[PDB]
Amino acid sequence: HYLVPYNQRANHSKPIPPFLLDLDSQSVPDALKKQTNDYYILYNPALPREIDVELHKSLDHTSVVCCVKFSNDGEYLATGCNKTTQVYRVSDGSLVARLSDSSDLYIRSVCFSPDGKFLATGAEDRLIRIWDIENRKIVMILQGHEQDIYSLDYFPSGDKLVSGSGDRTVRIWDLRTGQCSLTLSIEDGVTTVAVSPGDGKYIAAGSLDRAVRVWDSETGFLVERLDTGHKDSVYSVVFTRDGQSVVSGSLDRSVKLWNLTCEVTYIGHKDFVLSVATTQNDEYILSGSKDRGVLFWDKKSGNPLLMLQGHRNSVISVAVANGSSLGPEYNVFATGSGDCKARIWKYKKI
């Protein structure tokens, strides 16, 4: 059974592992797959089936779920869809709040403030709204973008926010003064932004032009430009939790690990890669794709460990939780799909 040679990890042109060439679950041995009425998992036949994945809660939405994100403490999940943004209690999946301010205005991105009291949302009306969750009221509106806001992320300090837009800019907002402190302009649309963990010294942005850019957040100077580069638009980027690398997902169907140079190109998805995230300690990389699956990757070797098929349409967003709201024996992650459902999953080592 195929395995990625340690010498070809960075190699962009390796083949799709045979066990992923056909996502059909009605042909693989009962020993290489886990099936339930709600989802099925395909395991890599070349490795020891370790990890078990289970569905914790399935949350109905009346429109495509564009984004999912956990609060810093891992106790809450916020989803964004058409017109409404919602907050759910992770432990029991209960609805804590549904926030709502031409027809059809999708909430493209959501993000909790570090202390979990506020929720920032980016919509197609070009506005960024900051919601006081407790009192269900908008406490600040950030205006300035000239196109849809595709991504938002808070600085660890909680007094600044970064946004990415189709207007080709990345903006840093001062939440103390409610003003735009800095505007970075590039050549094409910005699809995703991320703040480095800890001090928030760096900001990364994925772009329609196939590149990933990293700026020094205080000066606005471009420190790195990665473009082994992707062959199509980048749709998602996050920093590894150690703040040393960047992980990017692209429409070219690959995920890439960049050392702040491309160390690993994970090959396996059969369609657009739309979202990436890393688990604690960065042991695994999770990717959501238009192929309706979520792949778990061993970060170091680049080998795909298992494919989770738990949606009837594109996995648009993937988020991983910190802490352990479901017990010390579980790790939690969530998916937002075009099938109008947001699911909370729990996984463990067997």
Curated annotation (Swiss-Prot):
Lineage: superkingdom: Eukaryota
Entry similarity comment: Belongs to the WD repeat TUP1 family.
Gene: TUP1
Extra information: Present with 5840 molecules/cell in log phase SD medium.
SUBUNIT field: Associates with CYC8/SSN6 to form the CYC8-TUP1 (or TUP1-SSN6) corepressor complex that is composed of 4 copies of TUP1 and one copy of CYC8. Interacts with histone H3, histone H4, MATALPHA2, RFX1, SKO1, PGD1, HDA1, HDA2, HOS1, HOS2 and RPD3.
Residues of the full protein shown: 283 to 710 of 713
Annotated GO CC locations: nucleus; SCF ubiquitin ligase complex; transcription repressor complex
Species assigned in the record: Saccharomyces cerevisiae (strain ATCC 204508 / S288c) (Baker's yeast)
Intracellular or extracellular location(s): Nucleus
WD repeats: 60-89, 102-132, 144-174, 185-216, 229-259, 268-298, 310-346
Functional note: Acts as a component of the CYC8-TUP1 corepressor complex which is involved in the repression of many genes in a wide variety of physiological processes including heme-regulated and catabolite repressed genes. May also be involved in the derepression of at least some target genes. The complex is recruited to target genes by interaction with DNA-bound transcriptional repressors, like MATALPHA2, MIG1, RFX1 and SKO1.
Gene Ontology MF, one: histone deacetylase binding
Chief localisation class: nucleus
Name under which the protein is recorded: General transcriptional corepressor TUP1
Keywords: Nucleus, Phosphoprotein, Repeat, Repressor, Transcription, Transcription regulation, WD repeat
GO biological process terms, semicolon-separated: DNA damage response; hyperosmotic response; mitotic cell cycle; negative regulation of dipeptide transport; negative regulation of DNA-templated transcription; negative regulation of transcription by RNA polymerase II; positive regulation of transcription by RNA polymerase II; protein polyubiquitination
